[PDB]
Amino acid sequence: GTSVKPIFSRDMNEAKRRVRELYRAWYREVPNTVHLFQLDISVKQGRDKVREMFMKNAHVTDPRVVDLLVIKGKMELEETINVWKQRTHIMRFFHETEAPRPTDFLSKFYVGHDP
Amino acid sequence: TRPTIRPRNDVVHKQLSAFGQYVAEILPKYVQQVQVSCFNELEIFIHPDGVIPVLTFLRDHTNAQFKSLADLTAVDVPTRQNRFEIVYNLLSLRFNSRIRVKTYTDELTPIESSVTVYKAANWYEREIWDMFGVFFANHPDLRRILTDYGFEGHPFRKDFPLSGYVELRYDDEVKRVVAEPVELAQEFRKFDLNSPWEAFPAYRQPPE
Amino acid sequence: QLIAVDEKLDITTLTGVPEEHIKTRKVRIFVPARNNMQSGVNNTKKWKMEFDTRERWENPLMGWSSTADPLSNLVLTFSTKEDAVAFAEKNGWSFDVEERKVPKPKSKSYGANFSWNKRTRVSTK
Amino acid sequence: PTTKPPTARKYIWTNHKFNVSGTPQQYVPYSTTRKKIQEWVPPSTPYK
Amino acid sequence: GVRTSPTGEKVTHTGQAYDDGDYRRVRFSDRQKEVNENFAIDLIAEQPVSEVGSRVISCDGGGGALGHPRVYINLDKETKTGTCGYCGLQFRQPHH
Amino acid sequence: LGLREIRIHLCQRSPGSQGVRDFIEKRYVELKKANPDLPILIRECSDVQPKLWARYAFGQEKNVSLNNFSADQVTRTLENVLSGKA
Amino acid sequence: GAGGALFVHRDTPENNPDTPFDFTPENYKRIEAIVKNYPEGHKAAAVLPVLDLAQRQNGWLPISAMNKVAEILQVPPMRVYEVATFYTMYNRKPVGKYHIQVCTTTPCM
Amino acid sequence: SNLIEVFVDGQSVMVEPGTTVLQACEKVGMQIPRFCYHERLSVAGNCRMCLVEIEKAPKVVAACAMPVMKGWNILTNSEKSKKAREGVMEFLLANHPLDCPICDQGGECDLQDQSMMFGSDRSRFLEGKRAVEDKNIGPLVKTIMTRCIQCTRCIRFASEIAGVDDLGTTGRGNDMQVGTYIEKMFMSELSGNIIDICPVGALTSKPYAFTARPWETRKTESIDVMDAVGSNIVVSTRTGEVMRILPRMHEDINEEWISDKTRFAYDGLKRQRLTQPMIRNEKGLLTYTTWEDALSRVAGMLQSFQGNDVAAIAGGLVDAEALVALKDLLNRVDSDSLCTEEVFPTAGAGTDLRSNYLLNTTIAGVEEADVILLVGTNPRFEAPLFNARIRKSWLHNDLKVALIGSPVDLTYRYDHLGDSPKILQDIASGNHPFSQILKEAKKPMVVLGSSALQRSDGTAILAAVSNIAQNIRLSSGVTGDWKVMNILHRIASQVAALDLGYKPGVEAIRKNPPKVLFLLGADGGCITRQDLPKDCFIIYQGHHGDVGAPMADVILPGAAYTEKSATYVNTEGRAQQTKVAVTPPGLAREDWKIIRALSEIAGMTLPYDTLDQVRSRLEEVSPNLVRYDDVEGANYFQQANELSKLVNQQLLADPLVPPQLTIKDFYMTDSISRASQTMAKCVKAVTEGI
Amino acid sequence: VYDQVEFDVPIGSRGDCYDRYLCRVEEMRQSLRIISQCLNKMPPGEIKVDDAKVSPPKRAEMKTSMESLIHHFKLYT
Numbered sequence A: 001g002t003s004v005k006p007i008f009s010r011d012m013n014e015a016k017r018r019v020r021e022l023y024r025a026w027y028r029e030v031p032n033t034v035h036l037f038q039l040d041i042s043v044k045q046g047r048d049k050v051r052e053m054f055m056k057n058a059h060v061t062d063p064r065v066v067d068l069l070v071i072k073g074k075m076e077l078e079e080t081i082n083v084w085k086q087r088t089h090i091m092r093f094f095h096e097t098e099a100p101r102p103t104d105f106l107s108k109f110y111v112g113h114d115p
Numbered sequence B: 001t002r003p004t005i006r007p008r009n010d011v012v013h014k015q016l017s018a019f020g021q022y023v024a025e026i027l028p029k030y031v032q033q034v035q036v037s038c039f040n041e042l043e044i045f046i047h048p049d050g051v052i053p054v055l056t057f058l059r060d061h062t063n064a065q066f067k068s069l070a071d072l073t074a075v076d077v078p079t080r081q082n083r084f085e086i087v088y089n090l091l092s093l094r095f096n097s098r099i100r101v102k103t104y105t106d107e108l109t110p111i112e113s114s115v116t117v118y119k120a121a122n123w124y125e126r127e128i129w130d131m132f133g134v135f136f137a138n139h140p141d142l143r144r145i146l147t148d149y150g151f152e153g154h155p156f157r158k159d160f161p162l163s164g165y166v167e168l169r170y171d172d173e174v175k176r177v178v179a180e181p182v183e184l185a186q187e188f189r190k191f192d193l194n195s196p197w198e199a200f201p202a203y204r205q206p207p208e
Numbered sequence C: 001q002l003i004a005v006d007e008k009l010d011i012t013t014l015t016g017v018p019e020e021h022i023k024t025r026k027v028r029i030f031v032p033a034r035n036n037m038q039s040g041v042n043n044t045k046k047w048k049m050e051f052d053t054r055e056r057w058e059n060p061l062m063g064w065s066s067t068a069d070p071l072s073n074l075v076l077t078f079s080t081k082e083d084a085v086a087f088a089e090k091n092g093w094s095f096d097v098e099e100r101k102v103p104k105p106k107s108k109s110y111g112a113n114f115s116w117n118k119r120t121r122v123s124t125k
Numbered sequence D: 001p002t003t004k005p006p007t008a009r010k011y012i013w014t015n016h017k018f019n020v021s022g023t024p025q026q027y028v029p030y031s032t033t034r035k036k037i038q039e040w041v042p043p044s045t046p047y048k
Numbered sequence E: 001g002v003r004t005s006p007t008g009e010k011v012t013h014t015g016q017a018y019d020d021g022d023y024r025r026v027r028f029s030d031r032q033k034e035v036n037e038n039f040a041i042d043l044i045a046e047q048p049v050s051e052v053g054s055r056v057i058s059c060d061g062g063g064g065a066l067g068h069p070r071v072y073i074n075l076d077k078e079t080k081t082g083t084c085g086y087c088g089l090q091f092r093q094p095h096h
Numbered sequence F: 001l002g003l004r005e006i007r008i009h010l011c012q013r014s015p016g017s018q019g020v021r022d023f024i025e026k027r028y029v030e031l032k033k034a035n036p037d038l039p040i041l042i043r044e045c046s047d048v049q050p051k052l053w054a055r056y057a058f059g060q061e062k063n064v065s066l067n068n069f070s071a072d073q074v075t076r077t078l079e080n081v082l083s084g085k086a
Numbered sequence G: 001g002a003g004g005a006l007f008v009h010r011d012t013p014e015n016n017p018d019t020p021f022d023f024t025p026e027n028y029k030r031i032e033a034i035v036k037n038y039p040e041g042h043k044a045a046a047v048l049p050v051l052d053l054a055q056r057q058n059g060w061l062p063i064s065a066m067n068k069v070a071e072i073l074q075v076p077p078m079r080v081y082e083v084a085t086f087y088t089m090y091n092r093k094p095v096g097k098y099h100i101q102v103c104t105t106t107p108c109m
Numbered sequence H: 001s002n003l004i005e006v007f008v009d010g011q012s013v014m015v016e017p018g019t020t021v022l023q024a025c026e027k028v029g030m031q032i033p034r035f036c037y038h039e040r041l042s043v044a045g046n047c048r049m050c051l052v053e054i055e056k057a058p059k060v061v062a063a064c065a066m067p068v069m070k071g072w073n074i075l076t077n078s079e080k081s082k083k084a085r086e087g088v089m090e091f092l093l094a095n096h097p098l099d100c101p102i103c104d105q106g107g108e109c110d111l112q113d114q115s116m117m118f119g120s121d122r123s124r125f126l127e128g129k130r131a132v133e134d135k136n137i138g139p140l141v142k143t144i145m146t147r148c149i150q151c152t153r154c155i156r157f158a159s160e161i162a163g164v165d166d167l168g169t170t171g172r173g174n175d176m177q178v179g180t181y182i183e184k185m186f187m188s189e190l191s192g193n194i195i196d197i198c199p200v201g202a203l204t205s206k207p208y209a210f211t212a213r214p215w216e217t218r219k220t221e222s223i224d225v226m227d228a229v230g231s232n233i234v235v236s237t238r239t240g241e242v243m244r245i246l247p248r249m250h251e252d253i254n255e256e257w258i259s260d261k262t263r264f265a266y267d268g269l270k271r272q273r274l275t276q277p278m279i280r281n282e283k284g285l286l287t288y289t290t291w292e293d294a295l296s297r298v299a300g301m302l303q304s305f306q307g308n309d310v311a312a313i314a315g316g317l318v319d320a321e322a323l324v325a326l327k328d329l330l331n332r333v334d335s336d337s338l339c340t341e342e343v344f345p346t347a348g349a350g351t352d353l354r355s356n357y358l359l360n361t362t363i364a365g366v367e368e369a370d371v372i373l374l375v376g377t378n379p380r381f382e383a384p385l386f387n388a389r390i391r392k393s394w395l396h397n398d399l400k401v402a403l404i405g406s407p408v409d410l411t412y413r414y415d416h417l418g419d420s421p422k423i424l425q426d427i428a429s430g431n432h433p434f435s436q437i438l439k440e441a442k443k444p445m446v447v448l449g450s451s452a453l454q455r456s457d458g459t460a461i462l463a464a465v466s467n468i469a470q471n472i473r474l475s476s477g478v479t480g481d482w483k484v485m486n487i488l489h490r491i492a493s494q495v496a497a498l499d500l501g502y503k504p505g506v507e508a509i510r511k512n513p514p515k516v517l518f519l520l521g522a523d524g525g526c527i528t529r530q531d532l533p534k535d536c537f538i539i540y541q542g543h544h545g546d547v548g549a550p551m552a553d554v555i556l557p558g559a560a561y562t563e564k565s566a567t568y569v570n571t572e573g574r575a576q577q578t579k580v581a582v583t584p585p586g587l588a589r590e591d592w593k594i595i596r597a598l599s600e601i602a603g604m605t606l607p608y609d610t611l612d613q614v615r616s617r618l619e620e621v622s623p624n625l626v627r628y629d630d631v632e633g634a635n636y637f638q639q640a641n642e643l644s645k646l647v648n649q650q651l652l653a654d655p656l657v658p659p660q661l662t663i664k665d666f667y668m669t670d671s672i673s674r675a676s677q678t679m680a681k682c683v684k685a686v687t688e689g690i
Numbered sequence I: 001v002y003d004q005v006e007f008d009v010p011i012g013s014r015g016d017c018y019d020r021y022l023c024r025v026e027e028m029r030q031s032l033r034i035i036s037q038c039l040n041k042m043p044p045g046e047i048k049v050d051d052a053k054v055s056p057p058k059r060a061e062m063k064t065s066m067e068s069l070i071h072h073f074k075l076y077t
């Protein structure tokens, strides 16, 4: 029951199919992105980052949430392909000027009060 | 009551009440409520499934003729199970009138795009999607319109913080503009202004 | 057409909040206490959701109050505690709820000020 | 001002200064408040 | 009422001067420190106390609508003077 | 290696703690008479389950469920932990 | 017009808590007779007459007289201060041997 | 039943007989404007702001005093009611001074708000205003008498709640004034509350003067640690600094009041603060260092010693999280010498039964008793809100109070049975008339202060009081849930420590002098270096430089109660949690985080990494410590009485004398209050007249 | 008071840029007309609603009257 209306997919199988299609499109786009934006990363780095972004949301079990995630990923792909994005936008995925924040207890205790 | 109080208009109030009754009788499938505000502003609450029929009837009917869409926006009310309130404002030039149509949705439920009924909605629905995250089904070209490229989240939502989560600055080592977690030299100072004494008895709620 | 989704509601991956501000945060759901400097009770009608206080420091220039907490100002208003709990749950925030405290009904009696044999009699008026 | 002189006050500047930006006489902002938290001062004598 | 700290820095009306070990003094090297020289506490301390032949006096700071809100000062205590809470002027009844 | 403390978390009005309650009503007194130096902390429990806790040297602990135990079962378990067994 | 009399007390060498005041033995007999009229447990009701009695022996009411009445009746001193400052026949300052009071209300005016 | 039906604006409601019009309007959720009515004071009826129209009645009635009559129809928004409110506001504002920009009441003024909501927007007053001279009633309450609207709330509070008759009205009519008529200091442990109840800026806080406005403040709802009552408070902050402390209404505990130490000792949080870790240099002087160095030194000393050598003393302001963390850390080195500065008898049941060391009746219960016996304690200074509850019962329920101890002034009349502890035995045997008094009492209550327990004969005193309770129980039977036995605590950390298995008292330290000592906020001066061997390693953790700091080898700066989310258990056994208002200053850290980091450095890492995990461990040890605001407990008085009958320690001849003999002693008691300049001013004011 | 002034509304014929330019020029002329009327018809009186719970009072009233000061304070905070 729970009486919900879908966006595109009726169960997780169709949602997974759409996820795979979007992943294929991003995988094909990465080399062109590296060429056009004149990025100093490799194609391997770009595809690894695409996989990491996809795996960030691997725990989702709602087909509607997956449909919205695919819609957002398609929005980002359309944005990248048309060059609406600049090199700064593409490089924002890699956080190159962010100092690594530690995760163990002792370093956090040393730096400050935040957990 | 004369010099400083806004005058009333009962004729327009009666006309709008009668027309609201008219609209409700013609479309019982979707119309849930009809209201006439004290300053003569007709409001019609409907079911989401009736977004396209209602508007179509309102813009096409001989006695309606609301051929112009002033604006279309959304309101976020987190306490409601259906978070978002979709508000259409329509103007009739033939009858020199205005009408407001309201419906509801939540985060995961699409609303039918009304680009077919009104061409003006295109950018309005894109803006609602960008600011609030409300998806519109069958929209020609749905994408962000106001926010920056790659911006995460929807700013107009009540939960979103006023200054957001990231800022921008130019970094010389990478020779480009970078986005970093927001740090503020001076924090925005939250004021508590609400008076502990009630202002308007006419709006008092039952004590539950 | 309806698809009968079976799972609990969860929208964290769509809100765009950085994960640090989803997992390490604690919200408080409460009806705010009446300000003891006044007698009005109109600010004790609705439920509030607010986040935990984070570090504030002193700006080296001008000595202003600096923060790095983006949720340090966010306050949400709800009709009932159930709505607040549902919002916090669907947004993925750990919460602490406090039951609403109401003043107990008190038996007032002006004439008690002038009791024949009781301790309640006023020594002044 | 020759026919309508301004009112005289003893705190009004007797010598006008121009825009002193980009000059060793420029304004430099600073906090005008005093220290908020005082720290404990350990005793100067040995404890044993 | 200006006066310098042991470091040679002027002390403001507020009383704040950077401490000897405070690095922030570096912001004044090759520049100056802005200090207003007309101390209000000293200037108001020079005004003569006004003698009035009534128990309650009124003050509006002078200038009518150009001063402060008008207030009424009781002058029954003879051990002290009535001080305006806006302007700082002092009033007393003719005593002794 | 040895006992340092005992903790008995019993729930005030749940049926599954009833027998444990009887123990404290009758058999706790003489058990404290026999063990004047052993801290037997009697504490109140939330709707989950009754429990007994034993602490050993260098902070080693493990617990035993007392759900639906009768008073004799409770004192048998307590003498088992109090003796060089289990 | 305005009253003129102050309703605060400031100690003076002639009017302080150590100003000598005490009832005469005859006045103590009268105080006992006054106290008896009221119901037991309601002894304060004698604040109004006994205070007056003090003024009838001393001429006026020094702060020590108010303290003595408060201690005799076991009433908090601030209650006696309230009574003394409320009623206009109580003299909290010395008066002349003869107190001339001329009426100036409308029928008399 | 006995309910009568009345109508508020044509709407039916059922009310109890004798209910005032104001309360009936409140039943439907309408608030009648007021200035002089306070639901915790006696009705006055003087302000006249509450006047309302009753249908078919020509005269408006005062809603705060008039009892509703059956079939009445209140009309709270009629023209008559509105015009009454407008006229009364006009008369109130006629003589009021134009002081809002300089008044501390500015954004929090009931007069301002009700003028905006119910009054007119204009003045037609064309005369001069009255002005009155200021009164000086001490260093805590600033007085600006011109602002007074003559509500008389201060007079009713002082007379009825505080128990003092210093305030009053002198003169009459327009010239009537509120004051003391003489130079007197209104000094009492509940005095500051007259600032809260005064609706105008006539009575304001002197320490708080001019510092902040209400709209800029951030409100953090928290708990007080200045005593064992656990009063609910609001900490108001602005830009990372604590502005002031306000009461928060809790019906069960402190109502809407707080003691003066709870209200005015917060400035001590800004003085003598430990901000950085410190170690002893080569010359034996304390010098700043990093966290890593200090933790490494402490961990080295911890690794070498174990068992009986390692010991810890907990102070008065420690929280349950830090206590359990320290307990686990010392257990990992096989140490059980974890003690408190406050002594509780360990004989018989001891800490074994929660009922034995708690105020079983509770604060709320005092309202249901008719006889109370207090032994060796001063309720007024050890627990001012508890004494306020006792006076409330004494005033409204004719509660009879008797005391065994020095004849301290409790602000209400009681029966002084004496100060000899042997009298307790005389009551227990039955030769005293008070034995008969307790025999016939339906809800007898016996309260023993923890302060009395500090002396050497305390185990005997507890046995005698338990004997009195047992005699009452066997003679009258058990009525049900009454719990005659009660223990009154004065230290915030004591009940949680006892709940955690900590051994009360410092006796085990003297029995087994340790080599490594952990002073966890312990500033009582109980254990000095004369009571310890040489080369003893003393580690102090806390937020203030006090008795315990300058005698230590390593100093670890901790967080005060305003800078952490920590759990405290009051005298009732109720568990409450504080919230972070501001972060700890400098390099100071959360106490349990200090202990956990130290455990990691020494190799025996504690299982918990977050606050929820440490509270899960807290639940594992004592489950009642995570049930915030729950006070239900099981009575085990019979078992504890049996276990107490074993030993027969002899009673001392020394008369029962409390530590807080007089008001001056009340102010400076703990490290936060000892660092407060406001408390120093209060002490100077109560010792020196001026 | 737009119902009390007289002006014409320019109307185009072709819907192009040229027609929109002519409309704006004529609109400028009609605004001159309306301004002329407004100049000749300005009445006397106060400038804000005589309701101090909405509009701030005058400064002289704010410095003389208690209600005016209270309303100034509350309206500006």
Ligand code: SF4
Pocket: H096, H097, H098, H099, H100, H103, H104, H105, H106, H107, H109, H110, H111, H112, H147, H199, H200, H201, H202, I070
């Ligand atoms: S008490 Fe209220 S009305 Fe009076 S001056 Fe202060 S803020 Fe203004």
Ligand code: SF4
Pocket: H147, H148, H149, H150, H151, H152, H153, H154, H155, H178, H197, H198, H199, H200, H202, H203
């Ligand atoms: S000082 Fe405050 S509480 Fe006391 S009478 Fe005046 S207004 Fe009322």
Ligand code: FES
Pocket: G103, G104, G105, G106, G107, G108, G109
């Ligand atoms: S006696 Fe003079 S007016 Fe009455």
Ligand code: FES
Pocket: H033, H034, H035, H036, H037, H044, H045, H046, H047, H048, H049, H050, H051, H062, H063, H064, H065
């Ligand atoms: S509130 Fe009723 S007269 Fe004051």
Ligand SMILES: [Mg+2]
Pocket: H105, H194, H195, H196, H197, H198, H199, H200, H201, H202, H203, H204
């Ligand atoms: Mg006040």
Ligand SMILES: [Zn+2]
Pocket: E059, E060, E061, E068, E084, E085, E086, E087, E088, E089
């Ligand atoms: Zn002035």
